């Protein structure tokens, strides 16, 4: 199995991990901050997804330094993962296009 496929495969795994970990850590970091809503795990996971995909609807978000730091890591991993998938696809199309040209 080529690397772009294997990497794309890994990116997925790590992303899911980042989501779970970021969910856990967001709660740990936000409880204790008056008025924070990112304090229960189920909605904390939803928040992590909507952040990683960059949808960010605005229903939930961190107010503390650490919550925002955790948030950045989720953002980055999310943009990179989906972005790496794009890389793999391009690589996939390139290879086959070369073949289609007899190369």
């Amino acid at each position: 199995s080529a690397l772009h496929w294997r990497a794309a495969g890994a990116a997925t795994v790590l992303l899911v991990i980042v989501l779970l970990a970021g969910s856990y850590l967001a709660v740990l970091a936000e409880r204790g901050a008056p008025g924070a809503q990112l304090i229960t795990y189920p909605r904390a996971l939803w928040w992590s997804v909507i952040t990683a995909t960059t949808v960010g609807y605005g229903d939930l978000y961190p107010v503390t330094l650490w919550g925002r730091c955790v948030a950045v890591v989720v953002m980055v991993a999310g943009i990179t993962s989906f972005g790496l998938v794009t890389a793999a696809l391009a690589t996939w199309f390139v290879g086959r296009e070369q073949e289609r040209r007899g190369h």
Partner: antibody, heavy 118, light 106 residues
Framework: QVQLQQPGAELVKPGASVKLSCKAS????????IHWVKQRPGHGLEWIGE????????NYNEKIQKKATLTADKSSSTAFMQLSSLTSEDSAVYYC???????????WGAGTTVTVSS | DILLTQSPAILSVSPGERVSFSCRAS??????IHWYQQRTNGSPRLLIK???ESISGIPSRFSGSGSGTDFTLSINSVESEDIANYYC?????????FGSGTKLEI
């Protein structure tokens, strides 16, 4: 079986401190939070604080005078609440509770009636 | 800090009659509300979670409803054993808070 075991009573002289416990049994998860609730005779329930055993962090009520200090023992599955420099004003029932990190108190301990007298 | 107002503080009802307790949050909180029943000398016990979700062990007689700011805990055909104090509790914003409570008198 009783998920949370709490001592029946604790007599404390004014100015002294006491350390309440809360033995936990049953299913346990890294996302569990143990809350403490004060209730004086004839009155409502007051949120005192909380702590997450898996990590060891605890938060407290900012609307009241901090008298408690929460700790946890992962090996013995026991949560402790240190109350210090108590006065009659601190005489009440202190309940411990378990929240699966989803916002509600699924189970409460029987409660420890603390009396502050000489 | 969300203020949960429970009024009236006491509710007189006749046997087998329907009753409804009220709990109003100072601000909107979706359906992040939990109801507890505490009998004389008894420890608090969860009745309804997230405004209307049932709980195992609890009688089908108990029901919940509402969203936003106004929540209601209902009981169809109240019987002697329902006598006790009732509290709502929010988990929408930190820190979690409790309503002052409503006593049920038969």
């Amino acid at each position: 079986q009783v998920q949370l075991q709490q001592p029946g009573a604790e007599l404390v002289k004014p100015g002294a401190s006491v350390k309440l416990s809360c033995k936990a049994s049953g299913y346990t998860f890294t996302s569990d939070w143990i809350h403490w609730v004060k209730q004086r005779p004839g009155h409502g329930l007051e949120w005192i604080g909380e702590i997450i055993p898996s990590y060891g962090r605890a938060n407290y009520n900012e609307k009241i005078q901090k008298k408690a200090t929460l700790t946890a023992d992962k090996s013995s599955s026991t949560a402790f609440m240190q109350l210090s420099s108590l006065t009659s004003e601190d005489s009440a029932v202190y309940y411990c509770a378990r929240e699966r990190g989803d916002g509600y108190f699924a189970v409460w301990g029987a409660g420890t009636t603390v009396t502050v007298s000489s | 800090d969300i203020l949960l107002t429970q009024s009236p503080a006491i509710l007189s009802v006749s046997p087998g009659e329907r009753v409804s307790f009220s709990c109003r949050a100072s601000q909107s909180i979706g359906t992040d509300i939990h109801w507890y029943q505490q009998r004389t000398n008894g420890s608090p016990r969860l009745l309804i979670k997230y405004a209307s979700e049932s709980i195992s062990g609890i009688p089908s007689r108990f029901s919940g409803s509402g969203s936003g700011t106004d929540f209601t805990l209902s009981i169809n055909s109240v019987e002697s054993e329902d006598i006790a104090n009732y509290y709502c509790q929010q988990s929408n914003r930190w820190p979690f808070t409790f309503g002052s409570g409503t006593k049920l008198e038969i």
